[PDB]
Design a protein around this ligand. Structure first.
Ligand SMILES: CC1=N[C@@H]2[C@@H](O[C@@H]3O[C@H](CO)[C@H](O)[C@H](O)[C@H]3O)[C@H](O)[C@@H](CO)O[C@@H]2S1
Length: 633
C-alpha cells in the first residue's frame, strides 16, 4: 500500500521546508514576496499577540482563526514567540506603507503583521485569514510589503426604490473588508422625519438607527459609506408626494422624477434632506448624482429653466447654465458643512454663463459625454465608474465579465467605452463596480450576491495591486474560490429552520394551515398552504421597479411556482420570486417572515401603524400584511 499519512509538522517555525511548498494565494495579490528559509505553522498553542491598543483586532483575528482552523487560538499581550501571529502598528512607516498598506514577515519570530495605521494592521490580518483558511496551516517563510495603488476602491450599491436588506448590506461590508475595498456609494433613502419632508417616508427606507449601525460596522472595516440622493433627476422616490416641487414641462405636465431647480422651496427641500443625512453618515463627501435629468426628453421642453437661467445668471444663460448653477449651489452648501461634492460625469454639460466648479469629484460612467482625456486636460478629479463594471438585475447589457476584462488588459485608466487615460494621472482616485436593481423581480438579492462574487475580486485586485500575477483569468478563478468568503458570510444563517411542516398562527387570516416549507438555492422558502394546495405570494400592490413597495400590501395564495430554478428562467421570474420568503430568528428564538423581494416584514395590522401610504389605504385591521420592520417592532 502507499503508506499515505498526514505530514503533521510541529507548530511554529521550522528551518526546513520544501523549496516549492505552495504559498496560499490572497486577493488582492501581495506582489514581490521575497522568499526566506523555512516555514511557519499555525498549531496548538499559537496565539495572536499585540499591544493593548490593538487588543480588539487581535481578539477578533484569534476567534476567527479558531473557527477556520479548528485550533484554539487565543489573543494575548506582552512577548510573542515563534508559535505566534504578532500585530504591530508602527505609524512611522507611512512612506513605505501609506495609510492602508501592510508588511508580513514570516520566519523564526512567527508571522508578523505590521501596518502604519489601525486599518493597515486590519488589512494585513485579512491576508493572514485568507492564507490560513485554505486547508494549509504551514506558510513559506519570507517577507512582503504591499499598499494599494489607488485611494478609492469599491462599489456603487444602489439600495434605491427597492430595499437591500441591512443583513445583506452587513455581509457585503464584510466581503468588501476581506477584499480591502474601502468605498461604497450607497444611493438610499434615510427615512425622512421632519415636517417639510415626512411625506417622502415611503418604502424603501432605512431608519436612522439602522444606518448608524452599518456605518459603525463599515468604519471599523475601513470603508467610507458615501450617501447619494440623486438630483435634480431620478427624484421619484422623493417627490411623489410633493408635486409642488416637481418640474412641469411647457404644457404643464409635471414629472415626479424632476426637481424644479427654479423653485427655491424645492431646492430647500433637497438641502433639508442633506441636513437629515448629515447626522448619521460620518463621511466627508456628498454625492448628488446629477445623471439623466432630461432622459426621455430635452431642455427645449422646459422653457421655464431658460427664463430662470437668464434671471439668475444673466442675459444669454441657458438651461445647462441653470443645471450647472444648481450643482454649484449644492457644492457651496456641502462645503460649508465640511464636505466635498461628487457627481456622475453626465452632469458635465456645455455651459455659457456658468462654469462647473472644479472642486467636484467626477465619477465617470458615460463615455458619450465630454471624453475622459478632455477631463484630464481640464484637471478634474476622476473616479472610473465604467459601464464595463455594471450589473443590473434586469438589463442584461450590464453583467460584468471579469474573464474578459482580466484577459483584455483592462486597468483603472481604462474608462468607459475602452477609452484609455494615463493610469498614473495624479487626480485618478480609483475605480468601482456598480450594482443596480432596475426591474427588480428578475433576481433576488441573494442571487445578486452569488453573481457579483468574481467581479468584486477582480476590482479588488486591479485597484490595489494593478497586476495580473495569474497567467489567465481561469487561474485567478481557481484561487479566489479556494480563498472563499470571509467568516461572517459563512456563518450567516440563511435558512434558520428546517424544511417540513409548520403551524404559523400569524397566517390564520389566509389559512388555518398547516404550511409546508421548502428551501430554495438562494436561501429563501416557499410556503405551501396544505389546505388549498396553493403557495403564499406577495404579488399585489403599488410598485417601484416592478416590486411591491406599498406599505400594508397583503399577501395572497397563488398556484405554486417552481422555486428551485435559477435566475436564467427570466420568463417565470415574477411568479417565482414573489413566492420566496426570508425567515429570520430574532434576539432570540422568535421568527419573522419577510417577502424576499420587498424586505418588509409580515405582521398583524393594528390600525395604529403610522406611514404616508397608510393615509390613503390601510389593510383591514387584524389581517396579515407587510410593513417596514420599524412600524411593527
Ligand atoms: C448613473 C447611472 N444612471 C443610470 C442608472 O439609473 C439609476 O437607476 C436606479 C434604479 O435602478 C435609481 O433610480 C437611480 O437614481 C438612477 O440613477 C441605472 O440603474 C444604470 C443601470 O441600468 O444605468 C445608469 S448609470
Amino acid at each position: 500500500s502507499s503508506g499515505l499519512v498526514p505530514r503533521g509538522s510541529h507548530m511554529g517555525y521550522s528551518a526546513t521546508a520544501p523549496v516549492n511548498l505552495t504559498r496560499p494565494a490572497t486577493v488582492p495579490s501581495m506582489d514581490g514576496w521575497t522568499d526566506g528559509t523555512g516555514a511557519w505553522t499555525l498549531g496548538e498553542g499559537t496565539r495572536v499577540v499585540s499591544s493593548d491598543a490593538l487588543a480588539a483586532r487581535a481578539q477578533s483575528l484569534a476567534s476567527e482563526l479558531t473557527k477556520f482552523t479548528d485550533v484554539d487560538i487565543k489573543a494575548a499581550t506582552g512577548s510573542a514567540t515563534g508559535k505566534d501571529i504578532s500585530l504591530t502598528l508602527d505609524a512611522s512607516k507611512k512612506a513605505e506603507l501609506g495609510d492602508e498598506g501592510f508588511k508580513l514577515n514570516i520566519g523564526s519570530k512567527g508571522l508578523e503583521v505590521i501596518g502604519a495605521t489601525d486599518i493597515g494592521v486590519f488589512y494585513g490580518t485579512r491576508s493572514v485569514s485568507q492564507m490560513l483558511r485554505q486547508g494549509q496551516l504551514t506558510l513559506p517563510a519570507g517577507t512582503v510589503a504591499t499598499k494599494p495603488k489607488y485611494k478609492e476602491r469599491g462599489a456603487t450599491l444602489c439600495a434605491c426604490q427597492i430595499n437591500i436588506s441591512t443583513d445583506w448590506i452587513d455581509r457585503f461590508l464584510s466581503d468588501m473588508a476581506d477584499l480591502r475595498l474601502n468605498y461604497v456609494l450607497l444611493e438610499m433613502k434615510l427615512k425622512p422625519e421632519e415636517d417639510n419632508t415626512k411625506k417622502a417616508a415611503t418604502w424603501s427606507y432605512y431608519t436612522r438607527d439602522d444606518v448608524k449601525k452599518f456605518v459603525k460596522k463599515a468604519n471599523n472595516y475601513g470603508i467610507d459609506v458615501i450617501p447619494e440622493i440623486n438630483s435634480p433627476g431620478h427624484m421619484n422616490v422623493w417627490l411623489e408626494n410633493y408635486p409642488e416641487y416637481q418640474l412641469a414641462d411647457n404644457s404643464g405636465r409635471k414629472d415626479p422624477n424632476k426637481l424644479d431647480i427654479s423653485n427655491p422651496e424645492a431646492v430647500k427641500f433637497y438641502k433639508t434632506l442633506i441636513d437629515e443625512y448629515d447626522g448619521v453618515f460620518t463621511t466627508k463627501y456628498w454625492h448628488m448624482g446629477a445623471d439623466e435629468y432630461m432622459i426621455g426628453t430635452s431642455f427645449d421642453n422646459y422653457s421655464k429653466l431658460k427664463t430662470f437661467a437668464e434671471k439668475q445668471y444673466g442675459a444669454g444663460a441657458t438651461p445647462n447654465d441653470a443645471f450647472t448653477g444648481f450643482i454649484n449651489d449644492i457644492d457651496k452648501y456641502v462645503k460649508a458643512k465640511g464636505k466635498q461634492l461628487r457627481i456622475w460625469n453626465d452632469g458635465i454639460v456645455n455651459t455659457k454663463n456658468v462654469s462647473l466648479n472644479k472642486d467636484i469629484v467626477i465619477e465617470y460612467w458615460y463615455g458619450a459625454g465630454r471624453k475622459p482625456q478632455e477631463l484630464v486636460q481640464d484637471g478634474y478629479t476622476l473616479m472610473n465608474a465604467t459601464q464595463a463594471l455594471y450589473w443590473s438585475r434586469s438589463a442584461q447589457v450590464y453583467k460584468v465579465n471579469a474573464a474578459r476584462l482580466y484577459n483584455n488588459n483592462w486597468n483603472v485608466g481604462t474608462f468607459d467605452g475602452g477609452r484609455q487615460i494615463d493610469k498614473n494621472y495624479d487626480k485618478l482616485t480609483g475605480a468601482k463596480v456598480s450594482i443596480w436593481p432596475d426591474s427588480s423581480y428578475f433576481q433576488t438579492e441573494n442571487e445578486v450576491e452569488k453573481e457579483i462574487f468574481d467581479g468584486m475580486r477582480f476590482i479588488s485586485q486591479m485597484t490595489w495591486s494593478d497586476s495580473r500575477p495569474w497567467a489567465t483569468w481561469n487561474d485567478m478563478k481557481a484561487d479566489i474560490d479556494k480563498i472563499g468568503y470571509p467568516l461572517d458570510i459563512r456563518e450567516y444563517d440563511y435558512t434558520p429552520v428546517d424544511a417540513g411542516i409548520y403551524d404559523i398562527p400569524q397566517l390564520k387570516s389566509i389559512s388555518k394551515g398547516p404550511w409546508e416549507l421548502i428551501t430554495t438555492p438562494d436561501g429563501y422558502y416557499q410556503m405551501k398552504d396544505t389546505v388549498s394546495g396553493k403557495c403564499l405570494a406577495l404579488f399585489t400592490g403599488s410598485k417601484h421597479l416592478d416590486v411591491v413597495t406599498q406599505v400594508g400590501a397583503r399577501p395572497e395564495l397563488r398556484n405554486c411556482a417552481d422555486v428551485s430554478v435559477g435566475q436564467d428562467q427570466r420568463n417565470t421570474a415574477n411568479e417565482r420570486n414573489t413566492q420566496k420568503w426570508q425567515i429570520r430568528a430574532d434576539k432570540d428564538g422568535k421568527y419573522t417572515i419577510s417577502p424576499a423581494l420587498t424586505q418588509q416584514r409580515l405582521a398583524i395590522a393594528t390600525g395604529n401603524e403610522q406611514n404616508i401610504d397608510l393615509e390613503t389605504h390601510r389593510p383591514a385591521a387584524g389581517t396579515v400584511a407587510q410593513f417596514p420592520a420599524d412600524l411593527v417592532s
